[PDB]
Amino acid sequence: GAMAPSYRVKRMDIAKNDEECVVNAANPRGLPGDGVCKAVYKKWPESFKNSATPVGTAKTVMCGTYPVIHAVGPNFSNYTESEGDRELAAAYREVAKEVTRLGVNSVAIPLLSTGVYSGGKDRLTQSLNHLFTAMDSTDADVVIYCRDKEWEKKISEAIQMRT
Numbered sequence: 001g002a003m004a005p006s007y008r009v010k011r012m013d014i015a016k017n018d019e020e021c022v023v024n025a026a027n028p029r030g031l032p033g034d035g036v037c038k039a040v041y042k043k044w045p046e047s048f049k050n051s052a053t054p055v056g057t058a059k060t061v062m063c064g065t066y067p068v069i070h071a072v073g074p075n076f077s078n079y080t081e082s083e084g085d086r087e088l089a090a091a092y093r094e095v096a097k098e099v100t101r102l103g104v105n106s107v108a109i110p111l112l113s114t115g116v117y118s119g120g121k122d123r124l125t126q127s128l129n130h131l132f133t134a135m136d137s138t139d140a141d142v143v144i145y146c147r148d149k150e151w152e153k154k155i156s157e158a159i160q161m162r163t
């Protein structure tokens with residue numbers, strides 16, 4: 001575990017993380033996809049061997065000795081708000097199990113279902129709160145990666161509010 005487990009946020013490409021493992025915002029089919037998933041495919045393509053997994057689950061594939069945790073958030077275009085919310089919480093619980101099993105001291109994580117799976121809605125608070133529910137009982141240092149400068153500010157404030 002980390003000596004003093006923390007949450008941090010960085011505004012940069014998760015493919016350039018400084019953590020001991022990465023969470024992919026995967027699609028269920030293990031396809032290269034777009035956004036975070038495409039960046040992860042370009043950096044760790046070997047990790048996409050038999051990575052296909054259902055919505056609400058996480059599957060880890062090693063790139064050399066570097067673990068890539070493929071986490072499949074719901075596409076809110078297809079799911080009801082109620083069912084999507086359940087699957088989004090579940091995906092994060094499976095990430096917490098995998099991070100614990102791997103025995104890593106740190107993990108890089110994107111906010112699941114906030115991009116092309118958002119169904120055109122702002123889900124920063126929804127997705128972050130499910131991330132905290134899952135990861136609060138783990139002792140890994142968590143580093144959240146985002147792109148938008150105003151999202152960085154909002155994520156940073158939400159972390160600081162609990163400290």
Ligand SMILES: Nc1ccc2ncccc2c1
Pocket residue numbers: 011012013014039146147148
């Ligand atoms: N500041 C950022 C955040 C995310 C990115 N993703 C890919 C490429 C450049 C990026 C820059």
Ligand SMILES: Nc1ccc2ncccc2c1
Pocket residue numbers: 012013014015035036039110111145146147
């Ligand atoms: N957390 C994020 C958000 C968007 C990105 N786009 C490309 C590559 C990495 C990225 C990480």
Ligand SMILES: [Cl-]
Pocket residue numbers: 025112113114115116117118
């Ligand atoms: Cl997404």
Ligand SMILES: [Cl-]
Pocket residue numbers: 146147148151
């Ligand atoms: Cl963002």
